[PDB]
Amino acid sequence: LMDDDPVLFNRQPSLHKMSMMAHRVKVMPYSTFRLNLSVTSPYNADFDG
């Protein structure tokens, strides 16, 4: 998997159609997915685990 590769990304539950979206991959070290802050609100997610 490489940079700029479109990948589908989802949070459960997927109540609405933009709870699952296509993003562009950026490969970076360490063991957490990284997201922009502004897309956390449509995902209805926080970084508490």
Partner 1 sequence: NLMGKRVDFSARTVISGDPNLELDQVGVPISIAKTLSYPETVTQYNIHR
Partner 2 sequence: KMTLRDTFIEYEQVMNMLFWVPSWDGVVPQPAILKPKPLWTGKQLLSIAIPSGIHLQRTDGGNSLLSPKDNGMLIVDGKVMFGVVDKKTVGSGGGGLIHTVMREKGPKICAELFGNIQKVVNYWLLHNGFSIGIGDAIADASTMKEITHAISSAKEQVQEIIYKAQHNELELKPGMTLRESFEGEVSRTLNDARDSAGRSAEMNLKDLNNVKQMVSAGSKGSFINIAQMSACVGQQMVEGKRIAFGFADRSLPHFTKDDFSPESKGFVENSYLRGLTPQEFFFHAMAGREGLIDTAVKTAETGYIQRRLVKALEDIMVHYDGTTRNSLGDIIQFLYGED
Partner 3 sequence: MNAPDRFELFILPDDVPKLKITPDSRVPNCIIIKFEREDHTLANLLREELALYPDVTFVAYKVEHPLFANFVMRLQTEEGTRPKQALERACASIINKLKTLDHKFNEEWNIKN
Residues near partner 1 (CB under 8 A) are 1-2, 5, 7, 9, 22-40, 45, 47, 49
Three-state secondary-structure class, residue 13: coil
CB atoms within 10 A of CB 4: 7
The answer to whether 11 touches 45, Cβ cutoff 8 Å, is: yes
In whole angstroms, the minimum distance from the beta carbon of 14 to partner 1 comes to 14
Using the rule CB under 8 A, which residue among 2, 13, 30, 38 binds partner 3? 30
Pick from 44, 39, 47: nearest CA to 14: 44
Residues forming contacts to Mg ion in the complex (CB under 5 A) are 46, 48
Which stretches of the chain bind partner 3, using CB under 8 A?
28-31
